[PDB]
Amino acid sequence: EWNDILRKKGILPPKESLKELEEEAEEEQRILQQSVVKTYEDMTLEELEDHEDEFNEEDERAIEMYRRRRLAEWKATKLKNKFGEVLEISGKDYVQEVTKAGEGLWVILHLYKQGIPLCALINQHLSGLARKFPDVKFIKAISTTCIPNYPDRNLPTIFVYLEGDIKAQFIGPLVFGGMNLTRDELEWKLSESGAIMTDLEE
Amino acid sequence: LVVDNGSGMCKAGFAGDDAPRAVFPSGQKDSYVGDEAQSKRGILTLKYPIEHGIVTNWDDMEKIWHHTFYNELRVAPEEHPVLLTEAPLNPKANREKMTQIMFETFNTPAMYVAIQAVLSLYASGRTTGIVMDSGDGVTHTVPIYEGYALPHAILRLDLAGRDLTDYLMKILTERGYSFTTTAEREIVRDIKEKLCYVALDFEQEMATAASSSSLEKSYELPDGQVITIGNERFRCPEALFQPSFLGMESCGIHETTFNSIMKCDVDIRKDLYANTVLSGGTTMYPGIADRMQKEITALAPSTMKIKIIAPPERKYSVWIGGSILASLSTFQQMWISKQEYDESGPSIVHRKCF
Amino acid sequence: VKTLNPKAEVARAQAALAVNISAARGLQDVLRTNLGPKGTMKMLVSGAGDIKLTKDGNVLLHEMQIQHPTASLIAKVATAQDDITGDGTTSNVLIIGELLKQADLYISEGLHPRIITEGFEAAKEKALQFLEEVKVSREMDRETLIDVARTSLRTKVHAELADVLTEAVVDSILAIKKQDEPIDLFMIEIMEMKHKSETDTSLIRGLVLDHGARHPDMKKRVEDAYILTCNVSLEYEKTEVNSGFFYKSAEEREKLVKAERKFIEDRVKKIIELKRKVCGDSDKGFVVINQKGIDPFSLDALSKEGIVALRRAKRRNMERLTLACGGVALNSFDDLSPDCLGHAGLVYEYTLGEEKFTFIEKCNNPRSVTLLIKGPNKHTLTQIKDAVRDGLRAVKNAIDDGCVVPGAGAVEVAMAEALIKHKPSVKGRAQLGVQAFADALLIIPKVLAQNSGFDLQETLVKIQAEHSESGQLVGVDLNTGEPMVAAEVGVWDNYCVKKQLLHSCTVIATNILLVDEIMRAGMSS
Amino acid sequence: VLVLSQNTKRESGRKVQSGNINAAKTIADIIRTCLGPKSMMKMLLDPMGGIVMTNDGNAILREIQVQHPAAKSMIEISRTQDEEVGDGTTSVIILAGEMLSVAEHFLEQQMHPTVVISAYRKALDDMISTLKKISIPVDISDSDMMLNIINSSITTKAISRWSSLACNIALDAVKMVQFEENGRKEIDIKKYARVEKIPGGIIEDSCVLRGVMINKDVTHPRMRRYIKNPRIVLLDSSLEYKKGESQTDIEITREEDFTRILQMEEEYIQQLCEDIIQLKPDVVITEKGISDLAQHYLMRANITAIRRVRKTDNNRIARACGARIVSRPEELREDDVGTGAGLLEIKKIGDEYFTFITDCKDPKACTILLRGASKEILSEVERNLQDAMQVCRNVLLDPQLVPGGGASEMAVAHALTEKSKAMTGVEQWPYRAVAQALEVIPRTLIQNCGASTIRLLTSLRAKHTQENCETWGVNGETGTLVDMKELGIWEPLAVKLQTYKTAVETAVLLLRIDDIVSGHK
């Protein structure tokens, strides 16, 4: 009564506010439910192999167009699978790959001294990663011949380079310390460098 | 009808309006026919019959009321309940006299009116809290609890801002160039509306305005001169608080307020403690609030707390209160209508019961 | 038309028709359950936390928070009906809404409503002549009016309240200044005395007032009282023309003070002299009452005297006591005689809670009396007040003329049959409306069937086939539903009631059904 | 870089003119069915917040608030027409809108407003000339034809069913407020013909009282309520000691003045009432207060007192009872004691007492008894009554009549169509245009029904040519070609001549708009 008369006249009490927030949130919640079916035919590339449970009609215009774009995508992605073995170049050439390493290609510049299970396990993880991402340039070597008399208490130091610009750093075991460190966590860190797009729990 | 005979004005709109449409200064259509020209100029000639908070004439009020909403408001009050204002305090005689004229010349269905203090309290959005009705010519204390003004709790004090200006010009002769003429009274009031603030107190303000002279404000005015050392400005509020300045030595206004609150039960005073809003009429400058706060805090027990409320604009406050009460949606339970007017006359208005 | 004012509700023909029909449907369906001695009992809550128990239609209309054009028209029409007649107002809205529902089924069938309007007016006229010819007279006696009052008191309230109030009302109308001129109840007031049982309300010969000795040192019960009816100032007064006192010593102060209370004392000495002249000793009662106030000075001056004084009574109180006690009201003391005095037999006072009362009874020939309602609940008091108002309205509408018609569907079904047989005469598609118009009155008994608990068509056809060669005056029973003659129990109703009923219902239906377009203009953007 | 206030908005061209014409349409479409004896009712929401049901032009539009102020302009002309002659407002509005539509068909082809306005002037000239050439008189000497005109007027209104009834209720009320003073200036003041409405009662209960009916009551039980020949006097002084205008505060010094002052005030009241008692009165009414001493005095003499009365009611009662209002009881004369009332009547119509001053001689100011079932009903009946009195007054000041329902308007369209070809000039095209626009009048009447408008239109258009069969209109209830010489539909010439002039002139003035500015003081 009196409060709503106040409301017509004044705004001294606030009580009619904030009832639009949950309204808009629920609107968007109902809206975002059509994204599952919007791209049902626009994601899978095996739907042709999924005959008799995916076909209702074929317009042969946008769907053959989908095959065309899909095959272009496939050829573009499989023309780049050239790697998969971490390689040991020498320090003499080092200037030629710190700089002349290709523009638009990430370089995981790994430096290490073999012998500690830290460096050994890190080398194992990156070598196994090479089996998954053959589109990434891996480099392994002895830092002593890469950097003269490099402090041996600063290994293994991960370097992320492209066009001579350091984008990501992971210096020493201070960020990799522990035998509990695993495959997916390394992949997670290199994804966080901005090179890879994947998903992990933690 | 949201017409309200204020302190000197009558403002006519509707309950749902945000403001009255017409004013009451006590050639829109005056070049087409001139029918209303004569009526409105004649009503304009008639004066304001209300002074000091009591009605003083009766023929002129109805004379003005007839025209004021029969020639511009364009309303038939026979088909409308009526809501006017009234002088701050009157005995039942004026109320039951006005009922007679209203009915006998308009026969409007129902009525209700209330004291201006209640309208101000509603406008500020309160149903509780005593307001300092520092009206022109005379001030009054109206402690309002739930809306109805207590007939046993109204106090009236003769202080006025006119009196403050007069006392200033009674100690402005001591300032050298005195001020008494109409122009000089006007310039004293102008300076008062420019600077008569309160910091804490008389002697300490005068020391900081004379020993260090850092409270001086030079008056570069066509009608003014640099004749104030910071004394005369603060010399207006002081007599507002300390009676012996004016030569009429009595108790302070704070004493009157304190007694008018203490005579009631202590519990309800808590609610009166709650808001304790103020009103203008003689006060327009800050420093009033905290000063009276601490001054009555001397009179207020430290175990209980006190609040001070003062809105900056209170010009249509009575009109706002009237508009709110016109839409309260329960005030019709207290309408006094023909069903009782033609049954009992003015006797029920007198509260024959109790 | 949302272009001339972008914010304006514009509704076309069918929109207006549909909204009117829906509102009427809601209203009529809500009000079905509020008629008959077996209607459903409604509880209402005001905008304060206050509760009223009503069976009245207008109360329901004006207590609902409803903001609608047709609902507003309904409220106004029912207000007028309650003002004029004030009984069975439910019938108004039921008839209007039922006719709306009927005409819907044919306008929806492409029938433009004008033709239905002329059909309805022809049905009005024919039913008018039928009711005029079947209206039957009877000399107004005590038992006739007992039955007439029982009708309305079973209509609006329950059994025992009806049982007491029929007696109360029939005795109330007996008390009258002039049997051969119209009665008016402003001389017969209603006062609410909320401390006793619902069965303790009764009628009191004379008047009882709510205000007593404003200067209490007086007696407690007086007998054989003469009455003084004055309208003069018995309190101190200041002359309108302003003036002041002037002196130079305290002796002048004493003189002026003692001379300032001289005129009022002269008045009271006039009164005391008149009292002693009218009656000296022997303790004969002598009551003085002034409309205006009495100052404490003269109050004590007369309280030390055995005289009892009353002040500040209702304005019509004195005007009715003028006739009641047989005296003449005094407006000044310029001349005076004992003739202007009234008289009463016994006057006593009784206290309750915070207020006391002054009883004036044993009138020599009671021509003004008072009805007292005693009950626990204030809403119960108000409901009984509505009941007594309905009873007095019904008895007035009975006595004013000398004709009355059977109720409870009897004459309703009678003109139903008559109009059905007459319809072959009338022409055009308006004929169909006549049928609908017939169906109009059919709502009246069948809701009673809904208010009784029987199959509606079964009872309807029983009563319709009850028609012998001549038109039986047969209504609907309230316990068996079988057709029964109206005269045997003797429940009837006033003629002009149904007359104005038909008038208002037909005209309002015309107004509703002729509309073309709905606007909500008047919005200043 | 700016020059003026940023709130300036100036627009011009044919586009805004066309928008104005569409505004004229959007007004004209709101009212297109409430015309003629066959009408379809319309309801409106009052801008103040109430409800209203009307079917005449201005009364609908006067309760309508708009933007695009041209709509306000047509509202203004609607109010002007309504207060001017008081009928056919819907007709004027619909004519204006549709003929503006027709003119737009002529503006759009590069044509100038000036030639259109010249054609407008020539068109209205020919309209009025031929209307006078066709306007026929009628003798105002009977109940027959007057009631026929009332029937023909309110057949388009809701009270058509009680037409004859209403007829009489109108006719009487006109003859008994009609007054003439100083050997000239016969007057029919509707204000003196005060309208009053009473809850309850039947529609047929409506009637005008041969006297004055007022909403008051006696002011004391003693004052009797039955007087056959009332000796009434019209008081204009308050009953209390006079205050005047002088200053106050005489100085009291002794103990023998106070009660002496009270007594002298009482004796002043004594003399003031005595000068009234002298002339042997029965009843007295006043516009101001009454003192208890005075009422006691008049009670001693058995005189009847009445408290404040409205000034308009005061003047009406002065006209009725033949008394002259006086404010000087101490200067009273025998000249003006009221006499001419048939009976003092103090009844209770409803539950509020009224005073009924039945009169026995020719009165000049009535109160109309009205009975119904709702304030809405009585308001609608009221509006019908003003229509009735205005049209009756117009006939009182016009002995000429022209048939309605669409006959003479088709006839004048034909006549001016014939007149157009005589001259040579392109201006005939806009000129003749308005006659084509005029052809809107019967359409709605047929369109109110749904008949084959084309054949009826062509038939009437032809028939108005041979043997000047210029008297044929449409029977609205039947929607069939008929002759007005038998149906009995006639309207005062004032209303339709006003319609002509007003519509043509507002058409003239709504064309001159090309440039608009907003955002200024």
PDB file of C-alpha atoms in Angstrom, chain B residues 116-262:
ATOM      1  CA  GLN B 116       0.424  20.848   7.881  1.00  0.00           C
ATOM      2  CA  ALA B 117       2.974  19.096  10.097  1.00  0.00           C
ATOM      3  CA  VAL B 118       1.392  15.745   9.237  1.00  0.00           C
ATOM      4  CA  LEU B 119       1.604  16.579   5.532  1.00  0.00           C
ATOM      5  CA  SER B 120       5.280  17.480   5.873  1.00  0.00           C
ATOM      6  CA  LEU B 121       5.968  14.257   7.777  1.00  0.00           C
ATOM      7  CA  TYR B 122       4.251  12.249   5.042  1.00  0.00           C
ATOM      8  CA  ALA B 123       6.209  14.106   2.359  1.00  0.00           C
ATOM      9  CA  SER B 124       9.463  13.224   4.093  1.00  0.00           C
ATOM     10  CA  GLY B 125       8.197   9.637   4.109  1.00  0.00           C
ATOM     11  CA  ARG B 126       7.651   9.289   7.839  1.00  0.00           C
ATOM     12  CA  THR B 127       4.691   8.326   9.996  1.00  0.00           C
ATOM     13  CA  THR B 128       6.637   9.136  13.176  1.00  0.00           C
ATOM     14  CA  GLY B 129       8.959  11.812  14.518  1.00  0.00           C
ATOM     15  CA  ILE B 130       8.361  15.282  15.933  1.00  0.00           C
ATOM     16  CA  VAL B 131       8.980  18.125  13.489  1.00  0.00           C
ATOM     17  CA  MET B 132      10.146  21.597  14.522  1.00  0.00           C
ATOM     18  CA  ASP B 133       7.488  23.744  12.867  1.00  0.00           C
ATOM     19  CA  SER B 134       9.526  26.946  12.763  1.00  0.00           C
ATOM     20  CA  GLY B 135       6.850  28.787  10.806  1.00  0.00           C
ATOM     21  CA  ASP B 136       6.800  32.474   9.993  1.00  0.00           C
ATOM     22  CA  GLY B 137       5.690  34.763  12.797  1.00  0.00           C
ATOM     23  CA  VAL B 138       5.509  31.876  15.255  1.00  0.00           C
ATOM     24  CA  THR B 139       6.928  28.376  15.729  1.00  0.00           C
ATOM     25  CA  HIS B 140       5.245  25.243  17.037  1.00  0.00           C
ATOM     26  CA  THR B 141       6.040  21.694  18.167  1.00  0.00           C
ATOM     27  CA  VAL B 142       3.962  18.837  16.739  1.00  0.00           C
ATOM     28  CA  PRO B 143       5.000  15.335  17.874  1.00  0.00           C
ATOM     29  CA  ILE B 144       3.372  12.944  15.393  1.00  0.00           C
ATOM     30  CA  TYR B 145       2.887   9.261  16.250  1.00  0.00           C
ATOM     31  CA  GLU B 146       1.377   7.086  13.474  1.00  0.00           C
ATOM     32  CA  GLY B 147      -0.034  10.196  11.770  1.00  0.00           C
ATOM     33  CA  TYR B 148      -2.505  11.843  14.154  1.00  0.00           C
ATOM     34  CA  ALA B 149      -1.429  15.028  15.937  1.00  0.00           C
ATOM     35  CA  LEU B 150      -1.908  14.927  19.702  1.00  0.00           C
ATOM     36  CA  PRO B 151      -4.195  17.706  21.028  1.00  0.00           C
ATOM     37  CA  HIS B 152      -2.346  17.522  24.367  1.00  0.00           C
ATOM     38  CA  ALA B 153       1.128  17.819  22.842  1.00  0.00           C
ATOM     39  CA  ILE B 154       1.240  21.005  20.747  1.00  0.00           C
ATOM     40  CA  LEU B 155       3.498  23.773  22.041  1.00  0.00           C
ATOM     41  CA  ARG B 156       3.664  27.255  20.530  1.00  0.00           C
ATOM     42  CA  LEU B 157       6.642  29.612  20.731  1.00  0.00           C
ATOM     43  CA  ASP B 158       6.611  33.203  19.515  1.00  0.00           C
ATOM     44  CA  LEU B 159      10.061  33.226  17.896  1.00  0.00           C
ATOM     45  CA  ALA B 160      10.234  34.269  14.248  1.00  0.00           C
ATOM     46  CA  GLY B 161      12.901  34.954  11.652  1.00  0.00           C
ATOM     47  CA  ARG B 162      11.451  38.452  11.430  1.00  0.00           C
ATOM     48  CA  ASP B 163      12.339  38.755  15.122  1.00  0.00           C
ATOM     49  CA  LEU B 164      15.877  37.510  14.437  1.00  0.00           C
ATOM     50  CA  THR B 165      16.364  40.126  11.716  1.00  0.00           C
ATOM     51  CA  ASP B 166      14.951  42.825  13.999  1.00  0.00           C
ATOM     52  CA  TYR B 167      17.305  41.831  16.819  1.00  0.00           C
ATOM     53  CA  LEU B 168      20.210  41.832  14.363  1.00  0.00           C
ATOM     54  CA  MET B 169      19.315  45.386  13.380  1.00  0.00           C
ATOM     55  CA  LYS B 170      19.033  46.053  17.120  1.00  0.00           C
ATOM     56  CA  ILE B 171      22.732  45.125  17.406  1.00  0.00           C
ATOM     57  CA  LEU B 172      23.591  46.444  13.950  1.00  0.00           C
ATOM     58  CA  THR B 173      23.350  49.956  15.390  1.00  0.00           C
ATOM     59  CA  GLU B 174      26.323  48.832  17.485  1.00  0.00           C
ATOM     60  CA  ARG B 175      27.937  47.922  14.141  1.00  0.00           C
ATOM     61  CA  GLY B 176      28.023  51.561  13.052  1.00  0.00           C
ATOM     62  CA  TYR B 177      25.902  51.691   9.906  1.00  0.00           C
ATOM     63  CA  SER B 178      22.529  50.523  11.192  1.00  0.00           C
ATOM     64  CA  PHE B 179      19.770  49.169   8.954  1.00  0.00           C
ATOM     65  CA  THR B 180      16.076  49.925   9.412  1.00  0.00           C
ATOM     66  CA  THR B 181      14.467  50.999   6.117  1.00  0.00           C
ATOM     67  CA  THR B 182      12.583  48.687   3.766  1.00  0.00           C
ATOM     68  CA  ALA B 183      15.659  48.429   1.553  1.00  0.00           C
ATOM     69  CA  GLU B 184      17.850  48.003   4.633  1.00  0.00           C
ATOM     70  CA  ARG B 185      15.546  45.345   6.101  1.00  0.00           C
ATOM     71  CA  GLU B 186      15.681  43.599   2.722  1.00  0.00           C
ATOM     72  CA  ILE B 187      19.477  43.687   2.591  1.00  0.00           C
ATOM     73  CA  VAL B 188      19.730  42.398   6.178  1.00  0.00           C
ATOM     74  CA  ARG B 189      17.500  39.488   5.176  1.00  0.00           C
ATOM     75  CA  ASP B 190      19.560  38.989   2.002  1.00  0.00           C
ATOM     76  CA  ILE B 191      22.809  38.786   3.969  1.00  0.00           C
ATOM     77  CA  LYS B 192      21.045  36.417   6.369  1.00  0.00           C
ATOM     78  CA  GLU B 193      20.078  34.169   3.451  1.00  0.00           C
ATOM     79  CA  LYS B 194      23.697  34.419   2.268  1.00  0.00           C
ATOM     80  CA  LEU B 195      25.594  33.615   5.490  1.00  0.00           C
ATOM     81  CA  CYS B 196      24.352  33.224   9.068  1.00  0.00           C
ATOM     82  CA  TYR B 197      25.729  29.735   9.691  1.00  0.00           C
ATOM     83  CA  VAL B 198      26.529  27.970  12.976  1.00  0.00           C
ATOM     84  CA  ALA B 199      29.889  26.394  13.757  1.00  0.00           C
ATOM     85  CA  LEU B 200      29.549  25.544  17.447  1.00  0.00           C
ATOM     86  CA  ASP B 201      28.801  28.488  19.711  1.00  0.00           C
ATOM     87  CA  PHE B 202      28.812  32.252  20.228  1.00  0.00           C
ATOM     88  CA  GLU B 203      32.030  33.082  22.058  1.00  0.00           C
ATOM     89  CA  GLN B 204      34.245  30.618  20.198  1.00  0.00           C
ATOM     90  CA  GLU B 205      32.942  31.796  16.820  1.00  0.00           C
ATOM     91  CA  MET B 206      33.477  35.439  17.804  1.00  0.00           C
ATOM     92  CA  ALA B 207      37.033  34.720  18.959  1.00  0.00           C
ATOM     93  CA  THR B 208      37.962  33.061  15.660  1.00  0.00           C
ATOM     94  CA  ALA B 209      36.309  35.962  13.791  1.00  0.00           C
ATOM     95  CA  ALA B 210      37.992  38.751  15.798  1.00  0.00           C
ATOM     96  CA  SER B 211      41.214  37.426  17.353  1.00  0.00           C
ATOM     97  CA  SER B 212      42.367  35.841  14.085  1.00  0.00           C
ATOM     98  CA  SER B 213      39.679  37.473  11.891  1.00  0.00           C
ATOM     99  CA  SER B 214      39.709  34.403   9.630  1.00  0.00           C
ATOM    100  CA  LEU B 215      35.890  34.180   9.545  1.00  0.00           C
ATOM    101  CA  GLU B 216      35.598  37.509   7.710  1.00  0.00           C
ATOM    102  CA  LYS B 217      33.774  37.569   4.379  1.00  0.00           C
ATOM    103  CA  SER B 218      33.983  40.837   2.471  1.00  0.00           C
ATOM    104  CA  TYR B 219      30.611  41.962   1.097  1.00  0.00           C
ATOM    105  CA  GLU B 220      31.075  43.223  -2.467  1.00  0.00           C
ATOM    106  CA  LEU B 221      27.435  44.008  -3.159  1.00  0.00           C
ATOM    107  CA  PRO B 222      25.650  46.968  -4.751  1.00  0.00           C
ATOM    108  CA  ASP B 223      23.321  46.921  -1.727  1.00  0.00           C
ATOM    109  CA  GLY B 224      25.970  45.744   0.747  1.00  0.00           C
ATOM    110  CA  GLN B 225      29.327  46.681   2.218  1.00  0.00           C
ATOM    111  CA  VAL B 226      32.192  44.998   4.044  1.00  0.00           C
ATOM    112  CA  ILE B 227      30.928  45.641   7.570  1.00  0.00           C
ATOM    113  CA  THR B 228      30.856  42.060   8.875  1.00  0.00           C
ATOM    114  CA  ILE B 229      33.898  40.608  10.656  1.00  0.00           C
ATOM    115  CA  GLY B 230      32.125  37.270  10.784  1.00  0.00           C
ATOM    116  CA  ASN B 231      30.149  38.437  13.828  1.00  0.00           C
ATOM    117  CA  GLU B 232      26.800  39.574  12.424  1.00  0.00           C
ATOM    118  CA  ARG B 233      26.346  36.447  10.300  1.00  0.00           C
ATOM    119  CA  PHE B 234      26.693  34.168  13.311  1.00  0.00           C
ATOM    120  CA  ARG B 235      24.830  36.850  15.264  1.00  0.00           C
ATOM    121  CA  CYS B 236      21.570  35.818  13.607  1.00  0.00           C
ATOM    122  CA  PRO B 237      21.471  32.153  14.758  1.00  0.00           C
ATOM    123  CA  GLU B 238      22.569  32.891  18.335  1.00  0.00           C
ATOM    124  CA  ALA B 239      19.346  34.624  19.360  1.00  0.00           C
ATOM    125  CA  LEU B 240      17.591  31.768  17.558  1.00  0.00           C
ATOM    126  CA  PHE B 241      19.013  29.517  20.296  1.00  0.00           C
ATOM    127  CA  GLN B 242      19.701  31.682  23.362  1.00  0.00           C
ATOM    128  CA  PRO B 243      16.627  33.738  24.343  1.00  0.00           C
ATOM    129  CA  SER B 244      18.407  36.351  26.467  1.00  0.00           C
ATOM    130  CA  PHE B 245      19.945  37.850  23.325  1.00  0.00           C
ATOM    131  CA  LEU B 246      16.567  39.245  22.287  1.00  0.00           C
ATOM    132  CA  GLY B 247      15.850  40.598  25.771  1.00  0.00           C
ATOM    133  CA  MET B 248      12.952  38.178  26.351  1.00  0.00           C
ATOM    134  CA  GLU B 249      14.753  35.905  28.805  1.00  0.00           C
ATOM    135  CA  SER B 250      13.014  32.522  28.995  1.00  0.00           C
ATOM    136  CA  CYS B 251      13.781  28.861  28.356  1.00  0.00           C
ATOM    137  CA  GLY B 252      15.288  27.568  25.138  1.00  0.00           C
ATOM    138  CA  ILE B 253      13.305  25.982  22.322  1.00  0.00           C
ATOM    139  CA  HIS B 254      15.193  22.768  23.057  1.00  0.00           C
ATOM    140  CA  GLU B 255      13.645  22.856  26.538  1.00  0.00           C
ATOM    141  CA  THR B 256      10.152  23.082  25.048  1.00  0.00           C
ATOM    142  CA  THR B 257      10.842  20.165  22.711  1.00  0.00           C
ATOM    143  CA  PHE B 258      12.338  18.095  25.522  1.00  0.00           C
ATOM    144  CA  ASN B 259       9.349  18.652  27.800  1.00  0.00           C
ATOM    145  CA  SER B 260       6.833  18.013  25.007  1.00  0.00           C
ATOM    146  CA  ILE B 261       8.541  14.675  24.436  1.00  0.00           C
ATOM    147  CA  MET B 262       9.065  13.707  28.095  1.00  0.00           C
TER     148      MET B 262
END
